Amino acid sequence: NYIFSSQLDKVNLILEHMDTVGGIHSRNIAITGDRGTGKTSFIETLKLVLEKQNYYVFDIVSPTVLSSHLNILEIVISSIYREIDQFIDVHDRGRLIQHLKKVMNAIAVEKKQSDYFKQSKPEIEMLTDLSHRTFLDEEIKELFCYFKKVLNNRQDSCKEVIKDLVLIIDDLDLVENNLVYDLLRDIQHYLDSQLIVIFAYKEGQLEQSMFEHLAKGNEALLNHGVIDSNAIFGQIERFLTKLVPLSNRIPLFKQDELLNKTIGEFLASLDPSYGVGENLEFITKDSEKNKNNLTIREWFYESIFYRTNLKLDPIDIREEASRLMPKTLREMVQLCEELHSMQVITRSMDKLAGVEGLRKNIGAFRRYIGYKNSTYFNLATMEFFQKWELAESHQANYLAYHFLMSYYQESFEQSGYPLTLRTMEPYNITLGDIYALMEELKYTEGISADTYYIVYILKVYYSLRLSELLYNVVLHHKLFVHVKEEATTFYMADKEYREHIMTAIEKVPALQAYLELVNAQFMPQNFNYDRSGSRDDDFYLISWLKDDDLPEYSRLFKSLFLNSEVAAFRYRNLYSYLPLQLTSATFYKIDFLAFAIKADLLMYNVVRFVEEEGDTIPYFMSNMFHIDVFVRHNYNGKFAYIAKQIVFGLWWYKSFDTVFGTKIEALHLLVDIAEQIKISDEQKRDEQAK
Amino acid sequence: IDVHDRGRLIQHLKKVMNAIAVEKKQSDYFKQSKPEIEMLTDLSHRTFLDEEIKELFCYFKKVLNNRQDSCKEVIKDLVLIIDDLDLVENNLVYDLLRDIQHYLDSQLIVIFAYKEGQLEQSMFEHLAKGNEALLNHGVIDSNAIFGQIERFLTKLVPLSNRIPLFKQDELLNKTIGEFLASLDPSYGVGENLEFITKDSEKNKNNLTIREWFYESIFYRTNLKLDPIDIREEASRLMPKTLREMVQLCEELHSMQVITRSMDKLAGVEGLRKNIGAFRRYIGYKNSTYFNLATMEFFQKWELAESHQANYLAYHFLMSYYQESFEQSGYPLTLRTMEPYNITLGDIYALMEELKYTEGISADTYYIVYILKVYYSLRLSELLYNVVLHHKLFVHVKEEATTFYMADKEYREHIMTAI
Amino acid sequence: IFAYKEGQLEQSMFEHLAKGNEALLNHGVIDSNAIFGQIERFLTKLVPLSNRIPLFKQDELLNKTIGEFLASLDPSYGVGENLEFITKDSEKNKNNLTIREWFYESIFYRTNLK
């Protein structure tokens, strides 16, 4: 099941069409696309096909051969001489040698080498040498005719007569630019109607190489406005039309049909037995549980998942994620090589040992992203991402905000609250403002294209760092099992509790770094949870008057929705993801999705995830595309329904899949608390969440 | 000193040398009026250089295998390593890359040992002058050239074959103990941040290089230079590479580290010296992003006597403030102000206002940090020089006691002592 | 032992690398920072910063006393109370004025100008 079969059949059809005409006609072929990589490269395979059809194929002209600085005629005659010297005809060999000498004279004459250009007193007979160059067409024709005759005379048992000589110039995709121009002319002048020349270039390299020469050939025409680029491009157009008829040019395998096919077909192209199993690991025998018909496009994401526990397929397709997957077959093979096992995380065993390898796969994928993300980056974005990496754990948000604002400004000249945080502390940015600014930039009456992919890559980098920090925290789960227990005691029914939480935080630097990344809010602090009109009148503000009058379970309504302790004045944290001690008669703003990122609740969830082995997994804020899903959620007596959505409704949504569990809880302790309510007074989970 | 295979190796070496000469337009083919037929063989040696090189390396491996005694084992492959490519005359490495593409791509195991994106930039330097008229007429952009380079390097070195190691991130994240063990298992840092050898058992080797840097600048300069505001980009000083880390340890190993023993009196004299040494180290580190205004400013600030320095610092910081105003405040109203009317509180106030200005960022923050560090160094140096000459004014202390324990002679005496 | 001044090495390296990086700098692929970092690490490896020794700029030159400099030329040289150069002992000399204000005090006594 050769994968370029159609192209090979078309080549053979072209060769068929031209074989009928034998009157010294111009016939050339131009192969374009990704004809390369491991062992099914179209060029060698085509050469072999031509060999068994009685076409004599010159040894492939590689960039190594072209780097010799010899013209294609010199290469061809050297190959002819070597071929005839390989064996030891007489009658035709001597004529072949005479024509070779004549061609070498013509080459020397063109090089202004002969005595004609170096003698004061020209003689008559050297004028013959000049003729050898002015009649080079006939000499070359006779040379190739006699070469074919000599080759036919070395065939044993009278196999068959050779049809024609074929010259292939491989790996022309990148040969010193102007050099290929020198090649083209050489083919136009000496080997146009002499052989079957196969070019094997890419896209519009020929046109650009011709333009590079003609433009310096047309300075004074272009600057005086006599001609424009259109005239030069038309010249090149008709030249290439005559050199290679557009019915003789064959494209193959760009990115479109590369991404559209199935992973199974590509793996078969490498070997019939290779496949991908249900854990997106590369399999060999049969499995019968394999998933080989997913197409490379979404196989890419489904297989990044199961290795990084990150669903990186964006809800918004404006983000140009397809700029990562493969771009060519070589990149596809190399991606498979980098990404084949990396200790793929499966759905077996006790769902505990897959965390250590997961952060490693995160690092490897970050390296792969950096390799991919090194082309369109110019200077500001390499700089920004580099500084963002080594931004400790808390200056990164400030840098990201100001970088995104730099993008915002680049379209403002041609007020908004998310745009009013430049004279803002690094500890007053959080992650919700980053996402809010990226959305506002996604909806700005300005620049596009590159900006969208910059936003996507920033989201990917943030997700990678968040997952890495979360997994580092999970590795050090023992150090704070106790606080989980305490948290249970603390809001199952003060100040030592906060003290303990801070002590436990200090002993795990990774937990610090994670909580500092998501300072206190991964959702925009503007978000409308009620899609009925505007945002609110006084909906998101509370008072919290005094402890002696707070109702039961009030500690829950301080760490679930109430991530700040301020009146709602310069050097102020304003967020304090730690347990909060609120004063009397003060307005406080509510954020419905703060539970997952509070220190005590996060560590409760971490210990629950590591210790308990059932079927649920606590929700962890490790992916910003989770925020993409969150902003898309409906959320709609009013407060109760929104709270239930936070607790139960939220748990598009395939980005919450996780490699460790089937479903996702929000905070298991809310279940136990619900139990106590039953004492004081899917259906069961719904009723408790209510 | 084989015979059977050496002669073939020599023949292939001669063929390769011919091919090289032919590529150099050296042979008689390019210098003779009247070409002969057999020199066309020499051209072939260059048009078939791949096969000649393959045979050469095959026979070289055979000859090397024939010199093994006691039949140890057969050689697997030939490996070529090109070290210290991080900085080789730019375009020269391009000439190397092509040479590897043309002659040694599928012949050996080539190890490149370069840094970051040096290869891409070196290729671009050549392709850009190769694509003048394409770029200026708008036919192509940098993206096309970068894609060309991208796929070329993808084929030359598969991205599964490239290995990075030890940038600054994991360099700063590890512990000082691990690095010192990387130098020698017995080296460590004691509780006074001095380098120890035996065991101590009071050592602090798990502090990480990041804050070990500051904790060890302290105990030598008596200066806590870790900034409360992390916007200030102090991490631009600590190390940047392992070589810089080793050299920092070399410069900063004892410098008569000030301990918590004895009578806390003799550590002042060495403290100002360590201040000077650290100022030198800062100047060495702080010589890259500085362009012309800041070298100038800091130089003048040094030799600003002892009182024009504040004026210079204020006007330099105001220069930074202005560079973002076009795109009233009281701290900004001191340019037509005497040098003796600036003080140090206005310098700090202006640096804070610049830290909170709706304008430029990045470099400005680190400039503020370095100015603060320089001021702290000068203040500590002057304070310690004063402390050295403490006897000369013991009497005034006593007088001060008498003076506000309960006039005009008192002021007179204070001025004389000053 | 190199015996150069200030940042001559960095500037000399930049003069070469900049013409080595025309098309990188004009197309915005790199800035002066990259070239300066290259030079920085090259010079860091060539001469460790623990191996470089500075001496006697203008700061400590102006801070010392005229007597110390004159002793650096010859132990007996000094400056008298009229700011004239003396040799024997005077015992009325003023050698501890520092070069900074000795400069002005000695322009005075010759031009009658403070």
Author numbering:
A (entry chain F): 28 to 115, 119 to 444, 457 to 535, 556 to 630, 645 to 712, 718 to 732, 745 to 774, 786 to 794
B (entry chain G): 115, 119 to 444, 457 to 535, 556 to 567
C (entry chain C): 228 to 341
What text appears in the publication on this structure?
The RADAR system comprises two genes, rdrA that encodes a protein with an ATPase domain, and rdrB, encoding a predicted adenosine deaminase domain protein. Here, we determine cryo-EM structures of the RADAR defense complex, revealing RdrA as a heptameric, two-layered AAA+ ATPase and RdrB as a dodecameric, hollow complex with twelve surface-exposed deaminase active sites. RdrA and RdrB join to form a giant assembly up to 10 MDa, with RdrA docked as a funnel over the RdrB active site. Our results define ATP mononucleotide deamination as a determinant of RADAR immunity and reveal supramolecular assembly of a nucleotide-modifying machine as a mechanism of anti-phage defense.
To better understand the RdrA C-terminal domain, we next determined a 2.5 Å cryo-EM structure of the divergent (<20% amino acid identity) RdrA from Streptococcus suis. S. suis RdrA adopts a similar two-layered heptameric architecture confirming conservation of the C-terminal α-helical lobe despite high sequence variability. Interestingly, S. suis RdrA particles existed primarily as 14-mer complexes with the RdrA stacked head-to-tail. In this conformation, although the ATPase domains are highly similar (RMSD 2.7 Å), the final four α helices of the RdrA C terminus undergo a dramatic ∼120° reorientation relative to the E. coli RdrA structure and flip out to form a protein-protein binding interface.
